[PDB]
Enzyme design. Structure first.
Site, PDB file in Angstrom:
ATOM      1  N   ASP F 166       1.003  -0.944   0.362  1.00  0.00           N
ATOM      2  CA  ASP F 166      -0.029  -0.294  -0.336  1.00  0.00           C
ATOM      3  C   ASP F 166       0.978   1.051  -0.153  1.00  0.00           C
ATOM      4  OD1 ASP F 166      -2.609   1.607   0.458  1.00  0.00           O
ATOM      5  OD2 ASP F 166      -2.543   1.530   2.572  1.00  0.00           O
ATOM      6  N   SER F 169       0.430   3.553   3.614  1.00  0.00           N
ATOM      7  CA  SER F 169       1.548   3.290   4.621  1.00  0.00           C
ATOM      8  C   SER F 169       2.695   3.250   4.214  1.00  0.00           C
ATOM      9  CB  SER F 169       0.846   1.695   4.909  1.00  0.00           C
ATOM     10  OG  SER F 169      -1.058   1.787   5.008  1.00  0.00           O
TER      11      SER F 169
END
Ligand SMILES: [Mg+2]
Ligand SMILES: [Mg+2]
Ligand SMILES: [Mg+2]
Ligand SMILES: [Mg+2]
Ligand SMILES: [Mg+2]
Lengths: 212, 222, 125, 4, 196, 222, 195, 233, 204, 196, 195, 4, 4, 4
Positions: F166, F169
């Site tokens: 991701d 993140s």
């Protein structure tokens, strides 16, 4: 952008800035906004970078074909009208150009034609085109006379771009100067606003708004 | 409604030396918050010592590179195997890009190589074909992070000679290939830290008179 | 459309349709042009086998293309009208784009171009 | 799109 | 609209309601939604009545011209022609068609063509607004190689529920039986099916 | 943002990444998304960063006053009820997505709260942009009767899935372990797998490089 | 573009046209002639969308000039106005219509009468004693209703026109940098240099 | 300009030491209605390529016909149609990639995400992705839809970079794919339990597996979940 | 009509060895039009420094608001507010206007008088705290500043070196933004002396 | 969501799926959609989770305060409190609730409260997105005064079909039995109900 | 409303304000004074939304006049500008904000210094040697950048102002019917009657 | 604002 | 936003 | 318009 061209006793003076933007992002400060179509013809660029650059280069091809076919350098009127008739065909498509076709011929003398992308074509003695046109007009109009010397005219053209370069957020980088005579255009150098501002401020005693 | 455009992220960087030129680009390909590939090259050897990258919407990027490569092939056929000069390539790409003025290629294009005097050259293009030769250009997502660093370190902007009272500028000089690759690697590590669409890998294509060499370096994968 | 190549080469290297067109010119009433020091004069023959003519309304042999250029001719009268009309349109078109009337050389070069096109276009004599 |  | 086609031992049976609505007003309460494209190839129309009619008319033309040249077309061939029109004109058509036919080699076959223009060959197919309410019932009750009387009951009970819950469906239950024997038309009135 | 909660036999563990972003730019490379509602009730927050901080501190303040008034250690269900009633009142205009976990006299608890005021119960939960990457790992490796050391490993592995896969993140893994009959241990930067590599060059400028117009001493004293 | 007036008097037609060419917050030019001579005794003033105005005016001029050469004959003002109207009437149902409004002032040599025609961009033609286009009309029409007489001389017509320009300079929001005045009569077209 | 009607969900795939694995469930969704349960979304081309297609099924069936037609055309005046001049995965991909981008450029896309998995004539593993925009990329692991969010993370734990491919066996790789399909069944609301899986190995060739089912599912822990906070019964 | 980019401007803060630096441009414009080349964006309440970018009316309003609050704080506490505490006050004040916010990007800088620790912090417009060891950036050229800082910055710079790093970071970032520049100010902050320098930069 | 409540001989049984979806992503696959408002008055929640939770919480509060003052409330009273909240806040609520309770006088009772805020007392009620597919099945199969084992099968088979066709429904089938005997929680796993 | 200029020189502040009040296609008035005296040595010019301008100006005037009576003392120009800014700063987050832009020219008797403050409707205050509001700035700022000197006399300031008005009359699209000029110095406020 |  |  |  900020481009001005004015007519005087000693010919035509053409001054442009060098700044290119993509919104509030400064893309470049080293952009040539004057195109040398031929030894006696100059083209100024404002608005869309791609549109101006592409079609003024194309104009240079059409002017070359004219002198091959007619064994004679194209008139400033005819050259300006090839460009104005071209953009008029694209009217409503969303071309963005503010343009001045500056040059000398025997039959016309020194001539300036404003040509923009909504198809306006105007002959005139003074034009300022671009986001910083009003800033350039302010200084140019208030100091302009027909009897300016070649030295004074070059300075006023330079000082009028500097004025806009300062106040207009979307103008600056450097000033590119040209002088058009009966003998053709003469390049009068690239002037970085970085050094030019402080030099002018000190020597002229102007720009008292700025912390010296 | 169907949106024909997308953003595949990544960033590219072209620097011109005295007798060489580099075109670097990260190897990450993304859509929204997902990684598509950690190694998808977007800096290509197009022949005739020209390297090219079209960063932005990868589909338009590949289409353009494909069309230019093909343009080089037909230039050879039509003009007795004549070498396409970098300046001639640049003008050709303007016509490719502006051809789609009313349905543009959603890419920022950079080419690098040597001019006809054997000196390093970088040309950068907007999406509709306005172009300009430069010493220095970053392109893509992290262009706004890298470009002001290049202004400071390559073109020595805002740097004055110590003790000259800010009167004498730091003099311009060509950088060695070693010094340029240091700036590229530090530009990309810095970009990777602060931009989410940049990372995974760095691929540099170096162009000298001897030809096109490649170098690869790991970047952070978060 | 009618496509036939009417103007073609013969073994001896002649285009007979172009040479037969010259025979039509040779049949036409005489036309003469003499240019002086500060003027040009166009003289034209009018055959006198036609009496009970109305010279007020009868097409004049010399035609104005623009206010500064004239065109006389010899040969087929009906054919001349097509050349004159095209020339007059090109004269106004030149003023509109170049912001300058045609030179005599340019207007001639155009008319000559039209005449040439009909010697290697299909379906036309 | 570059501006001038 | 509530339409379905069920394959059974001796062939295939087509079922439909008779209600055509503009808004909440019933424009026609005795509509024939089961239409002939060939002697033993029929279809069930759902969606735009203008479209479903225009499509059905063209297919009947294509299969008539096919028969003139190459003899009797397969049920698959008919479904392919329907698909070609529906798929290629997906942007301008609101038509859900169930194609059902009886070959002597292939026996009973059912092809469903939803909005997309996709083709799906199934043992049985249900379509139209009413169909949503009888997915549960039809899945639990359908068996392969049913008899004629079983398949008629299965369709009658199914469309009976569809009609009961769907405001857009109602009127009579029309059915068309396709077997080697020939073509049989069946009708069932509210007074019968309502109290099932 | 990637936050997870994992239940084990004698307690609950929550973990989070350390990346804060404004658009595609990384504002904070090491940010703390693990918040203390009470000594033995900890909270992980995704969504509007300001909103998660503010709602956490408010309920935390009210829980402390409630604990003093009742002379009782606070309960997770109290923090949950007060949060979800507050979030529901503002009809989702407070963009706080929380994983609430803790130990109290009743036992160990793990809940999730959405901005609109919906609550969920589970043995393993994940929230934020990297939740799908994290939940993939949790669904693959989670089992009944996890040990403390297994639950920390699973939780940190689920966060890592977010960090790598991701874009939202990245950086480090913060963990908090709440075990019954023990003090909660907050493990700030439990994993640091994204350390910046040594730069190729020092950009320490020669002194006097910057041009200066004026100097003056500023008066900070009275 | 903005202000174009026309006054037909006893023996002539007078066209006044503003000199300002404004784009944005800048008056680019203050000496613009918003007129073309179509034939020796026919003048057309124009106002409207930038580019379209001149492109339309010059296109009409070329067509009338072509007719004049072909027939060695000057088209009547009535004939020219009818031609211009039809071109605009075609234009309005085009892909991109000419947004140009015109006044055609002409002297009919056969009738020995001045004629003024007012044609909008839709192709709405009217013969008038006095005409105006844009906001100008909202001031000048009521003023001319009062002061105009059909048997006036050219000098009386110019004084009546001065009265219009004064009223416009007083009450109009925008600075139109005065007007260029031209007289069409039996002797053709001439420009008043001091106005 | 389209809107997809009947749709297929995730297609997932990865490389291993000797070849590639690709898998896709057998569902044709009609919005939230799980309409068609017998839909094959893996279409083999020759004995060396499998094309996995997600998105609109009517457009998938069109692409099926194009590939079927490509095999026929390739055989025309081609004595080496089953040898040196047989269709390669790289040929089949580039063709589809060209079509997908031409259709998007005409503002009439094929509303699909496509993964072309196969083994080249020289034994090299081929795995590349193309979608309705004409965007193409290659990676040791590729997935469409929810697969990109949930499958890729799990598959990348096995093959994180190029150097991991020779170290990954078909047993390990297939296990990772079958696990990913289970995770997608838990968490994708437009997925089904039934799926197809294809292995293209440079030694054993094309192995096509139909009517597979997700199994070894954890649901037992559900009995201990009561209410959403305070409820005890 | 984007409040955060009407007036334009930038602030940057950095930490060194026993010192902090905070710097800002001097431009205030109305979009394209440059209006003032004297508009300072850095204020101080005792030994705590606050830089504010964004809508200039809110820059002025918040300065007047924090002067008000720090003055009452000092009268009641009988001591000057510390950077860590002031940071919390800024956060509280901004989030108070959560559903009608001040269009600003504030930056706190200063040295704790008790511990002698250099402290910097940044906030979003709703008041979320961004604490950093290295540097904080804010304004219309934040992207540019992030790029400059991330490459130029190194830890434990001496005051005289830190001055060069922050100055070059601001100047080169401001020159790549249309709405920033027109002069700059740099504060070098040590435990018990503060030097304020005006930079020479290009005036376009 | 797929929820239903059925009255039978000995009381009433509540049934629900366990799937909570945001878009096509399953946020929770083990949701408890059967919630206690009183000892033998329970409800089934469909629509906004936030809204249905907030409503259920308030009702539990009202019935607790009712019990303090006036003893055990009727199932009708519980449904009236649900209606009052749903109807008066119809502009700000997306909640379809089935209220089911066991009195000793009234036995098993089922009230359904759709979006409007209207109240409908029924022998059995079905609600949520999945319900559309089982109107046909449930109507044909429901009988009054069924046994416990019959009612558990009826709910299991019904929700099994709803889950099969509705993407929005899935996971485990939770049930709650309300009789004089007390409160019994039942769970059924995919491996059982899928292959019914 | 439209054009309001201000020039601070050595010993005075000079405010020029356009006289035109335009609504639609009609100049309703050509003698409008877009200024209020707040105190004997403080003058405020204003431009913006119709009604709001005067309503705001008079409201400020009343409050400063009230302070002057209460304390028997004239508020400094700095103090008045700070008060005016806060009122606009409140206004912008009101239900219906004052759309008024102002220049405050004042002479501080304690400092013996002229002061010019430019405040927009958002409450953006700046002290300037010269200021302007609306489109006027786009011409005057670059002109004053060039010609302005800080040690100029009042007479030099008026000649510099004439240069601005000339440039605006040349290049501005709209007719603003000239300006009313007022000088603020140690002796208070007086109006130049011939400009 | 900031989001995490 | 979760649904049921 | 009619539907079926
Ligand atoms: Mg500037
Ligand atoms: Mg990164
Ligand atoms: Mg009219
Ligand atoms: Mg700048
Ligand atoms: Mg399901």
């Amino acid at each position: 952008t900020t481009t001005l061209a004015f007519r005087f006793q000693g010919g035509i003076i053409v001054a442009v800035d060098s700044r290119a933007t993509a919104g509030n992002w400064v893309a470049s400060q080293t952009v040539k906004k004057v195109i040398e179509i031929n030894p006696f013809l100059l083209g100024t660029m404002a608005g869309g970078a791609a549109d101006c650059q592409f079609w003024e280069t194309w104009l240079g091809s059409q002017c070359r074909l004219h002198e091959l076919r007619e064994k004679e350098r194209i008139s400033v009127a005819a050259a300006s009208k090839i460009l104005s008739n071209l953009v008029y065909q694209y009217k409503g498509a969303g071309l963005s150009m503010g343009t001045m076709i500056c040059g000398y011929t025997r039959k016309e003398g020194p001539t300036i034609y404003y040509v923009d992308s909504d198809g306006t074509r105007l002959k005139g003695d003074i034009f300022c085109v671009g986001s910083g046109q009003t800033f350039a007009y302010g200084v140019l109009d208030s100091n302009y006379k027909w009897d300016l010397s070649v030295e004074d005219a070059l300075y006023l053209g330079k000082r009028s771009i500097l004025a806009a370069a300062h106040r207009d957020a979307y103008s600056g980088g450097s000033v590119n100067l040209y002088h058009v005579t009966e003998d053709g255009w003469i390049y009068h150098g690239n002037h970085d606003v970085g050094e030019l501002f402080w030099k002018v401020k000190e020597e002229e005693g102007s720009f008292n708004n700025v912390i010296g | 409604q169907f949106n024909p455009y997308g953003d595949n992220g990544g960033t590219i960087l072209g620097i011109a030396g005295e007798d060489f030129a580099v075109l670097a680009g990260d190897t990450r390909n993304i859509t929204d918050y997902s990684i598509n590939s950690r190694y998808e090259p977007k800096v290509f050897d197009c022949g005739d010592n020209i390297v090219m990258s079209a960063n932005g919407f990868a589909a338009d990027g590949d289409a353009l590179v494909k069309r230019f490569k093909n343009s080089v092939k037909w230039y050879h056929f039509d003009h007795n195997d004549k070498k396409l000069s970098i300046n001639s390539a640049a003008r050709n790409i303007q016509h490719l890009l502006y051809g789609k003025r009313f349905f543009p290629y959603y890419v920022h294009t950079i080419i690098a190589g040597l001019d006809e005097d054997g000196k390093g050259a970088v040309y950068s293009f907007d999406p509709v074909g306005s172009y300009e030769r430069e010493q220095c250009r970053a392109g893509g997502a992290a262009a706004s992070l890298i470009m002001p660093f290049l202004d400071n370190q390559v073109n020595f902007k805002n740097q004055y000679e110590p003790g000259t009272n800010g009167k004498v500028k730091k003099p311009l000089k060509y950088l060695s290939v070693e010094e340029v690759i240091k700036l590229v690697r530090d530009s990309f590590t810095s970009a990777t830290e602060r931009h989410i669409q940049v990372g995974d890998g760095l691929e540099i294509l170096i162009v000298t008179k001897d030809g096109v060499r490649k170098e690869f370096y790991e970047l952070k994968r978060d | 459309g009618y496509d036939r190549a009417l103007s073609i080469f013969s073994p001896d290297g002649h285009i007979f349709q172009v040479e037969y067109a010259l025979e039509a010119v040779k049949r036409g009433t005489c036309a003469v042009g003499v240019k002086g020091k500060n003027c040009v004069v166009l003289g034209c023959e009018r055959r006198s086998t036609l009496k009970l003519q109305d010279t007020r309304i009868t097409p004049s042999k010399v035609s104005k293309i623009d206010s500064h250029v004239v065109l006389s001719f010899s040969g087929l009268n009906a054919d001349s009208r097509i050349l004159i009309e095209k020339a007059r349109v090109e004269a106004q078109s030149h003023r509109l784009t170049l912001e300058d009337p045609v030179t005599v050389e340019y207007l001639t070069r155009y008319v000559a171009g039209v005449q040439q096109r009909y010697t290697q276009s299909g379906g036309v004599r | 799109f570059l501006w001038x | 609209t509530s339409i379905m086609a069920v394959t059974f031992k001796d062939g295939v049976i087509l079922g439909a309601d008779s209600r055509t609505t503009t808004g909440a007003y019933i424009a026609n309460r005795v509509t024939d939604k089961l239409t002939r494209v060939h002697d033993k190839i029929w279809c069930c129309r759902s969606g735009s009545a203008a479209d479903t009619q225009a499509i059905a008319d063209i297919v009947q033309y294509h299969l008539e011209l096919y028969t003139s040249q190459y003899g009797t077309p397969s049920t698959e061939t008919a479904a392919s022609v329907f698909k070609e029109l529906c798929y290629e004109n997906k942007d301008n058509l609101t038509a859900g068609i169930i194609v059902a036919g009886y070959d002597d080699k292939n026996k009973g076959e059912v092809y469903t063509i939803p909005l997309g223009g996709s083709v799906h060959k199934l043992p049985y197919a249900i379509a139209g607004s009413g169909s949503t309410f009888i997915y549960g019932y039809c899945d639990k009750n359908f068996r392969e190689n049913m008899s004629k009387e079983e398949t008629v009951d299965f369709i009658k009970h199914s469309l009976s529920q569809a009609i009961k819950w769907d405001g857009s469906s109602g009127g009579v239950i029309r059915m068309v039986v396709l077997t080697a024997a020939g073509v049989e038309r069946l009708i069932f009135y509210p007074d019968e099916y309502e109290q099932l | 943002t990637t936050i997870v909660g994992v239940k084990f036999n004698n307690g609950v563990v929550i973990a989070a990444d350390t990346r804060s972003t404004q658009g595609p730019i990384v504002a904070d490379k090491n940010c703390a998304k693990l918040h203390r509602i009470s000594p033995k009730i900890w909270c992980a927050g995704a969504g509007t960063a300001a909103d998660t901080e503010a709602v956490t501190q408010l309920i935390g303040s009210n829980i402390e006053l409630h604990s003093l008034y009742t002379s009782r250690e606070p309960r997770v269900v109290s923090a949950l009820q007060m949060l979800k009633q507050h979030l529901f009142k503002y009809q989702g205009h407070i963009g706080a997505y929380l994983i609430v976990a803790g130990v109290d006299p009743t036992g160990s608890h793990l809940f999730s709260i959405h901005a609109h005021g919906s609550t969920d119960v589970g043995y393993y939960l994940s929230l934020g942009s990297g939740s799908l990457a994290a939940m993939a790992v949790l669904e693959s490796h989670w089992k009944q009767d996890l040990t403390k050391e297994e639950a920390i490993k699973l939780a940190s592995d689920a966060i890592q899935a977010g960090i790598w896969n991701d874009l939202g993140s990245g950086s480090n893994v913060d963990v908090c372990v709440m075990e019954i009959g023990k003090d909660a241990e907050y493990l700030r930067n439990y994993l640091t797998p994204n350390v910046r590599e040594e730069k190729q060059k020092s950009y320490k400028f020669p002194r006097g490089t910057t041009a200066v117009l004026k100097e003056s001493i500023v008066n900070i004293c009275d | 573009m903005d202000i174009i007036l026309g006054i037909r008097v006893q023996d002539s037609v007078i066209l006044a046209s503003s000199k300002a060419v404004t784009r944005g917050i800048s008056v680019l030019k203050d000496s613009d002639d918003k007129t073309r001579q179509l034939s020796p005794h026919t003048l057309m003033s124009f106002a409207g969308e930038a580019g379209d105005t001149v492109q339309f005016a010059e296109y009409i001029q070329a067509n009338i000039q072509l007719y004049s050469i072909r027939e060695d004959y000057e088209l009547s003002p009535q004939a020219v106005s009818s031609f211009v109207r039809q071109e605009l009437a075609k234009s309005i149902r085009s892909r991109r219509p000419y947004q140009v409004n015109v006044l055609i002032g002409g002297y009919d040599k056969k009738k020995n009468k001045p004629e003024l025609y007012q044609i909008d961009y839709l192709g709405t033609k009217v013969e008038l004693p006095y005409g105006a286009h844009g906001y100008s009309g909202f001031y000048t029409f009521s003023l001319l209703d009062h002061h105009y007489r059909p048997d006036m001389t050219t000098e009386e017509g110019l004084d009546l026109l001065k009265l219009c320009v004064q009223e416009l300079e007083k009450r109009m929001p925008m600075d139109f940098k005065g007007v260029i005045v031209k007289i069409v009569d039996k002797d053709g077209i001439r420009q008043v240099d001091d106005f | 300009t389209q809107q997809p009607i009947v749709t297929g969900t995730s297609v997932i795939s990865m490389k291993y030491d000797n070849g590639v694995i690709i898998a896709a469930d057998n569902l044709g969704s009609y919005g939230s209605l799980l309409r068609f349960n017998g839909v094959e979304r893996l279409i083999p081309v020759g004995d060396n390529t499998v094309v996995g297609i997600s998105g609109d099924i009517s457009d998938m069936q069109h692409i099926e016909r194009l590939l079927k037609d490509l095999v026929t055309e390739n055989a025309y005046d081609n004595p080496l149609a089953d040898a040196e001049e047989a269709l390669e995965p790289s040929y089949i991909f580039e063709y589809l990639a060209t079509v997908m981008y031409q259709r998007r450029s005409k503002m009439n896309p094929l509303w699909n995400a496509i993964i072309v998995a196969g083994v080249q004539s020289n034994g090299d593993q081929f795995l590349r992705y193309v979608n309705l925009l004409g965007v193409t990329y290659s990676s040791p692991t590729l997935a469409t839809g929810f697969g990109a969010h949930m499958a890729n993370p799990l598959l990348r734990k096995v093959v994180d970079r190029e150097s991991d491919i020779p170290k990954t066996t078909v047993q390990v790789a297939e296990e990772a794919i079958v696990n990913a399909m289970r995770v997608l069944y838990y968490r994708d609301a437009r997925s089904s339990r039934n799926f197809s899986l294809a292995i293209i190995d440079k030694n054993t060739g094309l192995t096509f597996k139909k009517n597979l089912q997700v199994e070894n599912m954890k649901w037992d822990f559900a009995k201990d979940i009561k209410g959403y906070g305070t409820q005890k019964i | 009509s984007d409040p955060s980019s009407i007036n334009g401007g930038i602030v940057v803060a950095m930490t060194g060895k026993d010192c902090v630096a905070i710097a800002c441009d001097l431009r205030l414009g109305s979009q394209s039009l440059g209006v003032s080349n004297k508009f300072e964006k850095i204020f101080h309440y005792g030994h705590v420094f606050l830089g504010i970018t964004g809508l200039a009316t809110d820059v002025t309003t918040l300065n007047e608001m924090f002067r008000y609050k720090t003055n009452l704080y000092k009268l009641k506490e009988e001591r000057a507010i510390e950077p860590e505490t002031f940071t919390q006050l800024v956060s509280s004040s901004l989030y108070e206007r959560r559903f009608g916010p001040y269009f600003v990007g504030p930056v706190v800088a200063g040295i704790n008088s008790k511990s002698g620790k250099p402290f910097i912090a940044g906030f979003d417009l709703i008041g979320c705290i961004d604490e950093a060891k290295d540097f904080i950036v804010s304004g219309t050229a934040s992207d540019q500043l992030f790029g400059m800082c991330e490459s130029l910055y190194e830890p434990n710079l001496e005051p005289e070196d830190l001055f060069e790093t922050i100055s070059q970071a601001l100047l080169n970032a401001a020159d790549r933004d249309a709405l920033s520049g027109w002069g700059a100010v740099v504060y070098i902050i040590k435990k018990d002396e503060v030097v304020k320098r005006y930079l020479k930069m290009r005036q376009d």
